[PDB]
Design a protein around this ligand. Structure first.
Ligand code: A1IWA
Ligand code: K
Ligand code: K
Ligand code: K
Ligand code: MG
Ligand code: MG
Ligand code: MG
Ligand code: MG
Ligand code: MG
Ligand code: MG
Ligand code: MG
Ligand code: MG
Ligand code: MG
Ligand code: MG
Ligand code: MG
Ligand code: MG
Ligand code: MG
Ligand code: MG
Ligand code: MG
Ligand code: MG
Ligand code: MG
Ligand code: MG
Ligand code: MG
Ligand code: MG
Ligand code: MG
Ligand code: MG
Ligand code: MG
Ligand code: MG
Ligand code: MG
Ligand code: MG
Ligand code: MG
Ligand code: MG
Ligand code: MG
Ligand code: MG
Ligand code: MG
Ligand code: MG
Ligand code: MG
Ligand code: MG
Ligand code: MG
Ligand code: MG
Ligand code: MG
Ligand code: MG
Ligand code: MG
Ligand code: MG
Ligand code: MG
Ligand code: MG
Ligand code: MG
Ligand code: MG
Ligand code: MG
Ligand code: MG
Ligand code: MG
Ligand code: MG
Ligand code: MG
Ligand code: MG
Ligand code: MG
Ligand code: NA
Ligand code: ZN
Lengths: 197, 97, 54, 158, 68
RNA sequence: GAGUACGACCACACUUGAGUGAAAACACCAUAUCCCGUCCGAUUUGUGAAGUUAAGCACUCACAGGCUCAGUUAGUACUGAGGUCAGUGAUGACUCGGGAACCCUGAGUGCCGUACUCCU
RNA sequence: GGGCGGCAUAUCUGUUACACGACAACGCAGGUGUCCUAAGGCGAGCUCAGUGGGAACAGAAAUCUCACGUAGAACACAAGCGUAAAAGCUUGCUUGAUUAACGAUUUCCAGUACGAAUCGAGACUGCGAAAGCAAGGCCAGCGAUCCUUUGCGAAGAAUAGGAAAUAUGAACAAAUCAUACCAGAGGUGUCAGAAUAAUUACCACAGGGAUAACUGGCUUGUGGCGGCCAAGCGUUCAUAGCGACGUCGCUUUUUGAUCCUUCGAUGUCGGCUCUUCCUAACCUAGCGCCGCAGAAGACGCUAAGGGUUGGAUUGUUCACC
RNA sequence: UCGAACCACCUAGUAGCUGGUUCACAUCGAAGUUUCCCUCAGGAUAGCUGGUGCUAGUAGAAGUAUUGUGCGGUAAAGCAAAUGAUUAGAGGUCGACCUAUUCUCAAACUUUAAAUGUGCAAACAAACCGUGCCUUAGCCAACUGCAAGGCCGGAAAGAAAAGAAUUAGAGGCACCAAGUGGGCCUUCUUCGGUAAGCGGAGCAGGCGAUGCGGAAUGAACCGC
RNA sequence: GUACUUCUCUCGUACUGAAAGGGAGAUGCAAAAUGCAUCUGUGGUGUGCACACGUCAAAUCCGUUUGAUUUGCCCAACACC
């Protein structure tokens, strides 16, 4: 025998196939699996990994977020160079809080109907991942983007709300209930809002 | 325990903001009202058949009570309550030993 | 163990379930399509009787 | 029987050394403690104000807070499967400046001095040679190592 | 019927299976909350000015890049 | 080579006897109207300068007691790891490592700062 | 086992505890539910316990005086630690034992409360010439929800709820009344907190060999049986016979200790009957030795082949005749 | 059928207790411990375990060393050192009392004091250098001095040489949950007990959950 | 069953307070007890995929790839404000 204590703890949960039943997702995975192994680009490898990911791990992105980070890169970019193609492995959703956006080329798995209308009306173009593979096979001049997930309600519930320093929402259908003892100093004690780590 | 009849302490009222002489009086609980909300609920619960509807405490263990003092500022007439440690014999004595 | 869950208030502590010893207290809607057809049939029958009144 | 109070089992821990009793000296009072310093948390039994708990006695940590009479020290403490960074509040008399980085600080300063000397035509000190190498040995005196009869009679008392 | 009162047997083995994790580094979770207030208040004034300096500095860099 | 004031470390600086002490200090010392405090100008406080190194103080001495650093005690006591080692056992030795303490004995008997002053 | 007892039920000191921390027992030795307007705070002076010398009545011990005195005293109460121009004693003035914007932390620990602490920021102060020192007496001395009860939201200003006027009783106003928000107090000692007397042999159920009573098993304190040494006893003479003070064993025919097996069951004492086995040998076969004349006996060795009774009383085993 | 008859019903009454619980292979794989509970045959709660992953694949690594730098009062030793215990002479009618030492000791005694341990550090968000620059209602009588947050530069055996580390050395972050919460045996340490295949602990291995090869035979011994 | 419809209802886009009741952008200029101006914009800082500029090392079938690193922007996240 060989002493291999805790060797199984070194292994990691790595998925190679997708759980998706979408045939067009499988076509994209087939296309970008080929590109991630026959090209040297790091963009194709990252895109291929994100196509295998679950829906929860492909958070959607707002149109205002794309335009903001595009402007942060538009400055400090030479006028000779064209703007990169924004690529997100996920959904692009419209944002009613920002009406005036520049013309951008956006590639995404799915566009909401309003988001596609807003991109086109600004002079931009909504791209498709098989179109991207033909104009940027190695991902040259692209802006890979991810949607936000820290604001999800599931994340806001994670952890115990009764321990000091915690601010997670409890699981409760009634908002008025679960507010008296343990939440106010007058009723026995209050859960401490801050704790040094 | 012997306690002075007058105490000079800080009066936090906006018209004093200084150390003033306070008259010392032991706190005594007031009478239970008949029309306090909990009393009204208790009387409604106790009516009719069913006997004693609430617990009645019996296993007394303490032999003392915490001492509470009502201190009244001479000028503002406001009252402040302070808590002393438990004692078996609390006495207000101006005569220093 | 229990874990972090909502405190349940599902009620259902009465004799609602029909079984032996309990008639139950339930109401299903398996007759909903048939009653919907009947109501439309009755409305069309009534219009013929009161014709030409609205 | 046995109890677990704040100062339980500290009969020898919180005691002065023999003939070394007394309150802290002036040099302790004049010592400057800054945020980010390394300090050893050694309780002074003659100052029964702001003493650390007996666990933190003999632990070295990093100062995170300085207050008119007190020092905030972050101390690692293993609990079950992890180590927590515990912040303790003590008076200044219970902390000593730690020399735990003295060898590392000297190593850095030697490198700077060597670099400056090498930069501008100075003679570097000669490199020390290993003592484990071979060589010829000329013995001035040679003695016989043996067990004698006298050795056996010398270990018998009475 | 009496049972065992207490033992620490197997506990160190359990605590080392997923190992005893090291402490968080000093540069993380270095909150100043609860520290000496007079120094905390003064540090906030400097940090507020530093943010204003950072905002202005990016404005100069953007103009300088557009200058060429 | 010394003194004074403030000191750092806090006996190699302490304790007991004995001797010596330039200068300038320090100190004993004189006194009680005022400031002040006491049973008592003893201590303390004020005002002084006639006297004295007699004490304090500083040095030096002692096969001095302590204390400090070494050596011995001693690779001893103890101890981490090992044996299908010895022994009925009590226990012990062995192998790879670590390693004391008192007694006893040798040497030593403060040191380092800031300011002012004497020697000058 | 349970019961009775006690409390190891909440909690403090020393030790067990194996020189970080942590560690059990109905382990060991002791504590806690209080006490204190000072026994809290501060400043200043002083030095304690004990000795030795001396002083009318005065002595072992009354008070006065001089030396010595590292704490050998004291600091409410257990213990440890700490402390000498103090942390002890005396004294003078005091209320830092108040308030303290939900600051942070430690101990227990799930890194939750509670109780105790620690480091702070603000107000008003007490002492001090001042640096400073104090928000109790360092470390044990205490309490959730609901309910009850108390304090705080003074008066006067605002053309409009504002930077600053507590709120509600939901059609609207006034005055009561009742609520609400914040901080305490009345208590749970089974001390993270039900409101609780017996009996059952007339008894019942679910279970437990997690747990007693009976057989076995481990142990052998106790019981029983023996050795070794040799003070004495034996007129004399330690050892014919035996053997104090000690010490080393064996046995499982006594009791105790334990709780491994059995609680969906291993039929409980005694006797009767019948067989077999052991030897630490009563008789029977040999043989030594003697305080061995004989007779009768004592002690010892080899040997379990053979034998080891009839009755009164008692259920008895034992016991006694 | 009687210390509360019989018949039907509520009633499939409740049971922390006893019994049962139906196919295969594969990848992983425990716990009998903590805290709270009218809690002790049971639960919650951490820990151990699986699944799902997330994140820039050597990153904030380590049940191990070395070198520096801290902590300690057990083994030992000592009583000719404090606190307790204690035998005997000697030196200053009998003794007492002093002075010196001497026979023997301590879980709740110690001057001293290990071995084994235990905390921290050993250059990539860091540290070092330029009285370089900005800011502050911070400190100081002020200041170019200290404190703090930054900015701009410089240098960086990326850590030499002296025995001068090594790694089957991808670090961090989550989510959802199961069983378990009767243990037992050995090595050293160790408490009660005359002792026990007895009761109770510390460290670490092991059985439980595991066979195989050996000690004839044996859950735990030896080897593996 | 399938096809069709809803000025509704519900869960969210806003949360706080016991309630009366209030109710969240950035930058600049400035300090008005409701201050002004502008609207293509991550509030700031540290660590941070890809991508873009380079710059080294190794290997190349000489086309490149495969590691490291500088600078810019940094997505998602984490930590201080
Ligand atoms: C009263 C009394 C003491 O005497 C006894 C006598 C018999 C028993 C029965 C047990 N003997 C072994 C098994 O455990 C049980 O067997 C059975 C058939 O139940 C218990 C105690
Ligand atoms: K208001
Ligand atoms: K049975
Ligand atoms: K015979
Ligand atoms: Mg959100
Ligand atoms: Mg679990
Ligand atoms: Mg559980
Ligand atoms: Mg859940
Ligand atoms: Mg029926
Ligand atoms: Mg100890
Ligand atoms: Mg100690
Ligand atoms: Mg047992
Ligand atoms: Mg148990
Ligand atoms: Mg003189
Ligand atoms: Mg003289
Ligand atoms: Mg230890
Ligand atoms: Mg310990
Ligand atoms: Mg006093
Ligand atoms: Mg004093
Ligand atoms: Mg508390
Ligand atoms: Mg207390
Ligand atoms: Mg105090
Ligand atoms: Mg006091
Ligand atoms: Mg106290
Ligand atoms: Mg105090
Ligand atoms: Mg209590
Ligand atoms: Mg309890
Ligand atoms: Mg009868
Ligand atoms: Mg059974
Ligand atoms: Mg049993
Ligand atoms: Mg039997
Ligand atoms: Mg026996
Ligand atoms: Mg027996
Ligand atoms: Mg039994
Ligand atoms: Mg039977
Ligand atoms: Mg059976
Ligand atoms: Mg039978
Ligand atoms: Mg025989
Ligand atoms: Mg025979
Ligand atoms: Mg026979
Ligand atoms: Mg009948
Ligand atoms: Mg149960
Ligand atoms: Mg079963
Ligand atoms: Mg496996
Ligand atoms: Mg039990
Ligand atoms: Mg069970
Ligand atoms: Mg069971
Ligand atoms: Mg010993
Ligand atoms: Mg010794
Ligand atoms: Mg002694
Ligand atoms: Mg000891
Ligand atoms: Mg490696
Ligand atoms: Mg058990
Ligand atoms: Mg919301
Ligand atoms: Mg509202
Ligand atoms: Na089992
Ligand atoms: Zn007043």
């Amino acid at each position: 025998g060989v002493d291999l204590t805790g060797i199984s703890k070194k292994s990691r949960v790595i998925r190679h196939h997708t759980y998706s039943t979408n045939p067009y997702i499988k076509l994209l995975i087939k296309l970008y699996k080929f590109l991630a192994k026959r090209t040297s680009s790091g963009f194709n490898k990252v895109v291929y990994q994100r196509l295998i990911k679950s829906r929860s791990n492909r958070a959607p992105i707002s149109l205002s977020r794309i335009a903001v980070v595009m402007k942060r890169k538009a400055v400090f970019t030479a006028k000779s160079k064209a703007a990169p193609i924004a690529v997100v492995v996920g959904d692009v959703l419209d944002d009613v809080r920002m009406a005036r956006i520049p013309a951008m080329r956006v590639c995404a798995l799915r566009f909401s109907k309003s988001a596609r209308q807003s991109i086109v009306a600004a002079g931009g173009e909504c791209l498709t991942f098989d179109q991207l593979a033909m104009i940027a096979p190695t991902g040259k001049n692209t802006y890979l983007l991810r949607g936000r997930k820290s604001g999800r309600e599931s994340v806001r519930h994670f952890g115990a709300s009764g321990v000091p320093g915690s601010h997670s929402k409890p699981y409760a259908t009634n908002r008025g209930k679960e507010t008296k003892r343990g939440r106010r100093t007058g009723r026995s004690y209050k859960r401490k809002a801050f704790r040094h780590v | 325990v012997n306690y002075p009849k007058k105490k000079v302490m800080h009066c936090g009222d906006a018209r004093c903001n200084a150390h003033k002489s306070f008259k010392v009086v032991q706190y005594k609980a007031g009478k239970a009202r008949l029309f306090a909300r909990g009393k009204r609920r208790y009387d409604r619960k106790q009516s009719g058949y069913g006997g004693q509807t609430k617990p009645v405490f019996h296993k007394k263990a303490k032999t003392t009570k915490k001492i509470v003092l009502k201190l009244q500022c001479s000028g503002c007439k406001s009252i402040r309550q302070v808590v002393l440690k438990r004692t078996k014999h609390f006495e207000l004595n101006d005569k220093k030993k | 163990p229990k874990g972090n869950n909502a405190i349940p208030h599902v009620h259902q502590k009465k004799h609602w379930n029909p079984c032996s010893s309990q008639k139950g207290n339930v109401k299903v809607f398996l007759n909903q399509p048939a009653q919907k057809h009947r109501r439309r049939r009755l409305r069309l029958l009534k219009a013929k009787k009161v014709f030409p009144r609205p | 029987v046995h109890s677990y109070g704040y100062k339980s089992g500290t009969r020898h821990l919180f005691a002065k050394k023999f003939r070394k009793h007394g309150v802290p000296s002036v040099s302790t009072i004049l010592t400057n403690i800054k945020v980010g310093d390394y300090v050893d948390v050694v309780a002074d039994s003659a100052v029964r104000e702001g003493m650390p708990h007996k666990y933190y006695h003999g632990r070295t940590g990093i100062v995170w807070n300085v207050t008119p009479r007190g020092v905030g020290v972050i101390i690692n403490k293993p609990v079950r499967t992890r180590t927590l960074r515990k912040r303790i509040c003590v008076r200044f008399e219970h902390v000593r400046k730690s020399r735990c980085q003295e060898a590392f600080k000297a190593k850095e300063h030697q490198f700077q001095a060597y670099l400056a000397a090498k930069k501008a035509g100075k003679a570097l000190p000669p490199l020390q040679k290993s003592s484990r190498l071979g060589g010829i040995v000329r013995p001035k005196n040679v003695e016989v190592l043996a067990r004698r009869v006298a050795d056996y009679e010398a270990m018998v008392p009475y | 019927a009496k049972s065992k009162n207490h033992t620490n047997h197997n506990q160190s083995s359990k605590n080392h299976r997923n190992g005893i994790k090291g402490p968080v580094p000093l540069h993380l979770h270095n909150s100043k909350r609860g520290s000496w207030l007079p120094a905390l208040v003064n540090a906030r004034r400097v940090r507020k000015h530093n943010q204003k300096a950072a905002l202005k500095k990016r404005r100069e860099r953007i103009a300088a890049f557009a200058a060429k």
